[PDB]
Amino acid sequence: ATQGVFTLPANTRFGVTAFANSSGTQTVNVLVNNETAATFSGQSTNNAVIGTQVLNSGSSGKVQVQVSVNGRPSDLVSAQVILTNELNFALVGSEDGTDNDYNDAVVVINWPLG
Amino acid sequence: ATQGVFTLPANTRFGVTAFANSSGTQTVNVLVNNETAATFSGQSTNNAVIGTQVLNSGSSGKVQVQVSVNGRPSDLVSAQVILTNELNFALVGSEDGTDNDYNDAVVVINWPLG
Amino acid sequence: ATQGVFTLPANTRFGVTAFANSSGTQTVNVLVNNETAATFSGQSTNNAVIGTQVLNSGSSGKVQVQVSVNGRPSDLVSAQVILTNELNFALVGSEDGTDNDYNDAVVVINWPLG
Amino acid sequence: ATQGVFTLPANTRFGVTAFANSSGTQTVNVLVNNETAATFSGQSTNNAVIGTQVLNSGSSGKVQVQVSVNGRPSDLVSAQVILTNELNFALVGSEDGTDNDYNDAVVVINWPLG
Ligand SMILES: CC(=O)N[C@@H]1[C@H]2O[C@]3(O[C@@H]4[C@@H](NC(C)=O)[C@@H](O)O[C@H](CO)[C@H]4O[C@@]4(O[C@@H]2[C@@H](CO)O[C@H]1O)O[C@@H](C)[C@@H](O)[C@@H](O)[C@@H]4O)O[C@H](CO)[C@H](O)[C@H](O)[C@H]3O
Ligand SMILES: CC(=O)N[C@@H]1[C@@H](O[C@@H]2O[C@H](CO)[C@H](O)[C@H](O)[C@H]2O)[C@H](O[C@@H]2O[C@@H](C)[C@@H](O)[C@@H](O)[C@@H]2O)[C@@H](CO)O[C@@H]1O
Ligand SMILES: CC(=O)N[C@@H]1[C@@H](O[C@@H]2O[C@H](CO)[C@H](O)[C@H](O)[C@H]2O)[C@H](O[C@@H]2O[C@@H](C)[C@@H](O)[C@@H](O)[C@@H]2O)[C@@H](CO)O[C@H]1O
Ligand SMILES: CC(=O)N[C@@H]1[C@@H](O[C@@H]2O[C@H](CO)[C@H](O)[C@H](O)[C@H]2O)[C@H](O[C@@H]2O[C@@H](C)[C@@H](O)[C@@H](O)[C@@H]2O)[C@@H](CO)O[C@H]1O
Ligand SMILES: [Ca+2]
Ligand SMILES: [Ca+2]
Ligand SMILES: [Ca+2]
Ligand SMILES: [Ca+2]
Ligand SMILES: [Ca+2]
Ligand SMILES: [Ca+2]
Ligand SMILES: [Ca+2]
Ligand SMILES: [Ca+2]
Numbered sequence: 247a248t249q250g251v252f253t254l255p256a257n258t259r260f261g262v263t264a265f266a267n268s269s270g271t272q273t274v275n276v277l278v279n280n281e282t283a284a285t286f287s288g289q290s291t292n293n294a295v296i297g298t299q300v301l302n303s304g305s306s307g308k309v310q311v312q313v314s315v316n317g318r319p320s321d322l323v324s325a326q327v328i329l330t331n332e333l334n335f336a337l338v339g340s341e342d343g344t345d346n347d348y349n350d351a352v353v354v355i356n357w358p359l360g
Numbered sequence: 361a362t363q364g365v366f367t368l369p370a371n372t373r374f375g376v377t378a379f380a381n382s383s384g385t386q387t388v389n390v391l392v393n394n395e396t397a398a399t400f401s402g403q404s405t406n407n408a409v410i411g412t413q414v415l416n417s418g419s420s421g422k423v424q425v426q427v428s429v430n431g432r433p434s435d436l437v438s439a440q441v442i443l444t445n446e447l448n449f450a451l452v453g454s455e456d457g458t459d460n461d462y463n464d465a466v467v468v469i470n471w472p473l474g
Numbered sequence: 475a476t477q478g479v480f481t482l483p484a485n486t487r488f489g490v491t492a493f494a495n496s497s498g499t500q501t502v503n504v505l506v507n508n509e510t511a512a513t514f515s516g517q518s519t520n521n522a523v524i525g526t527q528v529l530n531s532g533s534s535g536k537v538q539v540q541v542s543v544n545g546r547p548s549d550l551v552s553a554q555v556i557l558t559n560e561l562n563f564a565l566v567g568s569e570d571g572t573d574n575d576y577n578d579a580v581v582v583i584n585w586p587l588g
Numbered sequence: 589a590t591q592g593v594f595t596l597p598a599n600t601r602f603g604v605t606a607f608a609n610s611s612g613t614q615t616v617n618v619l620v621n622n623e624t625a626a627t628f629s630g631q632s633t634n635n636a637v638i639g640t641q642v643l644n645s646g647s648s649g650k651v652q653v654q655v656s657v658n659g660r661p662s663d664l665v666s667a668q669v670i671l672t673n674e675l676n677f678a679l680v681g682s683e684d685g686t687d688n689d690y691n692d693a694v695v696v697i698n699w700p701l702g
Contacts, residue, residue: 247557248559248688251559267472291474293473295377323443327556330437330475330477332460333437333466335468346444347447348447348589349474352447352470356466358461359381359407365673366673439669440669440673441555442669444589445590445594491607493603495700523637526637551672551675560681563677563679565669565677584635584691585691586691587691588634588691
């Protein structure tokens, strides 16, 4: 199934934050209405916050997360969870190797903000 | 029901990160086996990271998040989500006021690292 | 924080299914726009499906689960999770006693159908 | 990433329930210590419960859900969620066609029981 794609409410500010846990340099791209709105990169095996940014979901609400390492796309897993019918998290893990820890880049999207 | 309390695998490193979305200054405490292991403070209405750290779950694996604003305890909501039977997120939202957006301090715990 | 209340897309068919794990008779009421639309009762310590139904979320999309044991409300816990940005689960657990297993009545809501 | 595989606590009872939403007949197999422990089959486009059982998670606690329709393996999506650090849901969706609704068979695993 497709992973790393979330439909947010339209024209809504959200946070996006990326953590690294791999010997490979991670590149995280965040697309809004199918175009790149943000790019984060770094290399850590201790969960460094390689990027964090506030974006707007735009008229479609479509947000997509992609991850690559040395130009090779990582395998993604994802889901969304809502607490008390109000607080949203869209969660992404990624695997760039063979050990299947799926933490090589971890991305958290959250809304509402403010 | 209790919220903000999680049982991690014993002797396991995990990341804990907090964001703020309120006019009030957020105080986030993270307790491991009932001892304070991290404290974050800050203010933002734009999802700023007010703290991030790597901790160890110790012999008990018990992790608890508490949030307060100028001495007043915030009401908490929480859940844990596991992706591909491997990647763990423990998620906390908090309310410091009347609007019940539950984003005033937002805490994300993730493991495994490395 | 409020639990057992979910906003569905308007005018959408959803499944609702209740399970029992207690010596006490569980009464599960499912409200749509604040009026009872389905009621199930039963006693089981083996996860019996004490009822299942298809309902329509109506114009408001407001769906609420209530659980009691002979008129005494149970303590509820809940969350919503979305898989591949399509498949929705609204989840409820409840506690009717002192052991805090929170499984005494369990309710699963799922959409879309068909 | 692998989907429909969950590590439960060992030697622990869990409930498994399957729903159908497709013109294709769904067959769901539930495997415990890598052997089929339950098989459910049925056809519904209205969320009919096509089977439910209580099983023991065995030595490893590894539980696997597999879904097929007319002999063809369906594409799976899954996640686990834990409420108040106690109540566990393992959730499976599946796709047997081209519309990506992932509800064609829906499987819910829950524990603890009793
Ligand atoms: C009128 C006022 O300053 N109210 C704040 C409220 O911010 C407002 O923010 C709340 C604040 N209200 C005012 C008028 O200053 C006051 O009621 O305290 C709240 C916290 O108990 C404020 O909320 C937070 O809400 C604060 C609140 C914090 O306890 O303190 C009041 O005195 O901060 C705001 C910015 C939001 O993030 C809230 O979710 C958060 O709880 O809240 C309004 C929303 O209800 C609205 O955002 C106003 O613009 C804001 O001033
Ligand atoms: C031999 C080699 O170069 N392996 C890298 C692999 O890194 C190794 O991963 C191991 C654990 O699976 C150990 O940590 C080794 O010390 C390490 O060299 C690398 O894997 C990534 O980086 C490591 C540190 C972990 O975070 C992995 O989860 C992560 O996938 C991969 C990247 O594709 O390449 C080789 O296989
Ligand atoms: C002695 C008695 O009748 N107690 C009732 C509870 O049943 C016992 O619960 C304990 C755990 O607290 C244990 O399971 C015993 O075997 C039960 O007899 C009863 O608890 C409810 O039913 C249980 C079977 C269990 O599912 C529990 O989680 C659930 O809350 C409570 C509430 O109905 O009432 C007591 O009188
Ligand atoms: C023409 C036909 O019968 N096609 C079968 C699919 O049913 C149609 O699915 C489409 C969506 O792709 C749409 O709902 C049509 O009205 C159906 O007739 C069938 O899809 C499965 O059953 C559907 C009713 C729906 O639940 C869908 O999500 C599900 O995948 C597939 C099953 O492999 O077979 C087609 O031949
Ligand atoms: Ca890896
Ligand atoms: Ca890694
Ligand atoms: Ca607030
Ligand atoms: Ca706020
Ligand atoms: Ca109980
Ligand atoms: Ca019980
Ligand atoms: Ca389908
Ligand atoms: Ca379908």
